[PDB]
Design a protein around this ligand. Structure first.
Ligand SMILES: Cc1cccc(Oc2ccc(N)cn2)c1C
Length: 209
């Protein structure tokens, strides 16, 4: 059972701008997704200071980067607080609406795409390099869900029957055919070292077999 939803008009406009605009500095997608993972891990860490049982679904707080050349996917996994069904349908889009309006006003005033994180909508930079994005997430208070969008104005949500995650978020980037450089180890290492060197969680870059 798969539910299909329309993005709000403003978010569809931002995604289309990100996919169509000529912008060479695409590597900032990884900084934005890692930053999103680090915020999610801060949240579950804080909540567990006053409620240690919130870590029953997983004590480890980390980030894993997994390239897969056979599937042409780059996966960013965190064990953060994860996302509920309401987040995927309502809450994230509500905050992304005003962040998108501020971001697009700044772009006409001279700002550039690399500042997208300053407006809270850094996740959409994944469409600089991905033709489709799948998100598997599990929050302590809800079930495991799969979110997916190839842009074009819509996204889907379904209950995930795959491997149980425990807690956290998995962002699967189905890469465009001409962005496979972000599957190379030496390239991911360079981006992480340059943009995410001080993240206060262990970042493990997996190697391909
Ligand atoms: C994981 C994540 C974080 C922030 C935004 C985001 O996109 C979304 C998600 C849901 C709706 N309604 C609109 N944009 C995603 C997938």
């Amino acid at each position: 059972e798969v539910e299909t939803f329309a993005f709000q008009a403003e978010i569809a406009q931002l995604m289309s701008l990100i996919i169509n605009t000529f912008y060479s500095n695409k590597e900032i997608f990884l900084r934005e997704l890692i930053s999103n993972s680090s915020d999610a891990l801060d949240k579950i860490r804080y909540e567990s200071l006053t409620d240690p049982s919130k870590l029953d679904s997983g004590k480890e707080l980390h980030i894993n980067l997994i390239p897969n050349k056979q599937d042409r996917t780059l996966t960013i996994v965190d064990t953060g607080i994860g996302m509920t069904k309401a987040d995927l349908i309502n809450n994230l889009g509500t905050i992304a609406k005003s962040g998108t309006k501020a971001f697009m006003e700044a772009l006409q005033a001279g700002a550039d795409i690399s500042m997208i994180g300053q407006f809270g909508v850094g996740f959409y930079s994944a469409y600089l390099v991905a033709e489709k994005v799948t998100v598997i997430t599990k929050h302590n208070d809800d079930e495991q869900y799969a979110w997916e969008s190839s842009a074009g104005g819509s996204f889907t949500v379904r209950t995930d029957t795959g491997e149980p995650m425990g807690r956290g978020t998995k962002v699967i980037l189905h890469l465009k055919e001409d962005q496979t450089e972000y599957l190379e180890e030496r390239r991911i290492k360079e981006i992480v070292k340059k943009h995410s060197q001080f993240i206060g969680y262990p970042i493990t870059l997996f190697v391909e077999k």
